[PDB]
Each structure stands twice: as C-alpha cells, then as structure tokens.
Amino acid sequence: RTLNNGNLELGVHIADVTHFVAPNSYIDIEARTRATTYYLADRRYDMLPSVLSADLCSLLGGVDRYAVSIM
RNA sequence: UUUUUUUUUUUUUUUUUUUUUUUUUUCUCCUCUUUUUUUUUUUU
C-alpha cells in the first residue's frame, strides 16, 4: 500500500501453522516421518489429516486465519 | 341211551475309572544394450 507520506510499504504474509503441531506430539512425529509432500499427477497428498488444513488453514472465503505478516 | 381226567406268561440288580490343537519330505535354477547416474529455480 501507500502511507500518509507517499511511499510503498512492502510485506509478504505466510500462514502461521504452529499452534496445532505441539512439540513431541503425534502430529509432530508424523510430520518428522513424512518429510515431504508427494505429488503424482492426479491427486495431492496432505501432510495433515484432510480437514485440519483443507478447511482450517487455507485462505478462502473471508474468515479469520492466524498468519505471520512480515512488513 | 355217549361218563371221568390231562399245572403255567426267566430268577436278579444298591458298578470304580485321575485327558487335550497338530501328527510325516521333493533338487540345482543365464533378468538383452544411449549413458555418466539427473538434481538450482518458481508457481500445490
């Protein structure tokens, strides 16, 4: 955007998913095992269960969503 | 005018017992060919 002066503030905003993976959890060991999401060209393969992020983490609609905005 | 006699459905009951899925074979065996092995990168 522009501020009350005229210059161009820059910022990139990445989703802050750290609140649903606690250390030494079961989701955390799971992620530690499945290091990388694998993709074959029909479907994806969710690292998480299939509604924890595929409604609650995706920026859709205009509902509230925890994030991290560097600025 | 035709009297009298020739037995019948085996007797018995008031005996103890401390095991256990199955069960027993078949041999050694020539994997064909552009490669070192590619790899950052970004959009899920």
Side-chain angles (χ1 to χ4, degrees), chain A residues 27-68:
Chain A
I27 315 294
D28 177 64
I29 62 170
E30 188 275 331
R32 181 167 63 196
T33 61
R34 294 169 181 202
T36 307
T37 293
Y38 304 98
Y39 315 94
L40 64 85
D42 172 59
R43 59 182 172 175
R44 298 180 297 276
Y45 286 134
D46 193 339
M47 294 298 287
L48 280 296
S50 84
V51 66
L52 194 163
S53 171
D55 185 0
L56 189 150
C57 285
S58 182
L59 296 174
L60 187 62
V63 292
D64 281 338
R65 286 280 161 254
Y66 283 23
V68 166

Side-chain angles (χ1 to χ4, degrees), chain A residues 9-31:
Chain A
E9 67 178 3
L10 186 153
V12 188
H13 327 307
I14 296 162
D16 194 357
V17 183
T18 180
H19 294 286
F20 312 101
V21 291
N24 310 321
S25 299
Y26 291 165
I27 315 294
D28 177 64
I29 62 170
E30 188 275 331

